[PDB]
Design a protein around this ligand. Sequence first.
Ligand SMILES: [Cl-]
Length: 245
Amino acid sequence: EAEKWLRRFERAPDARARLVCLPHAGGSASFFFPLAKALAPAVEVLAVQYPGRQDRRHEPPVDSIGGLTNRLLEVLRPFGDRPLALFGHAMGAIIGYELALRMPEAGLPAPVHLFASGRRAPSRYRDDDVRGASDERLVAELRKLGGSDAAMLADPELLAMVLPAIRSDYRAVETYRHEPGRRVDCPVTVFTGDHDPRVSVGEARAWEEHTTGPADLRVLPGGHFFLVDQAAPMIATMTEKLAGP
Ligand SMILES: [Cl-]
């Protein structure tokens, strides 16, 4: 079951760290294929494939962020024989955070780093009536990813197969409620787009309130999907953070 959830596009047997990579609500494991190539051999990428995406399109979407986290903790166990860092974008950032919080009590060594991309701090909310994604937002964000994910849009048969799950997960993201007063103990490095309407700089810096460790905010040029255009400076930052304590 572990490799149905986790895709290893580039084996790196001598890697000093594994990086669990969690996509946004629309995204699939394949989004992270170039990162896997980029980070190996020093870091081994484990790209997460949520139920309902790509090859898992026939599976029902998860019941909640809580449930997804529960299921992912069990899946990550076999991979705990080396240090785990988490990278997540938007929805993925939330799950990354919840994983990080739960890992030690679940019987995994504490994560070595949390990279939170394109997401306001877990304690930060907005009174904006956003309880899910509009169809126009959903499609816009798929197009932005390019690759196999954007390709679905010219494939209405396959799009029909994955839409229910993607919609459900966007609703999960807005139904999400953090546990107040919790902090991870690992370093948190925050990536955010300078003109992302969904994440303000204050909201991004507020991740410092969710760790007892160092918090490093990096604002990069771009919107909600800045990470596509800004992969190089991000990868430079990630490789350095993961090359030391
Ligand atoms: Cl999302």
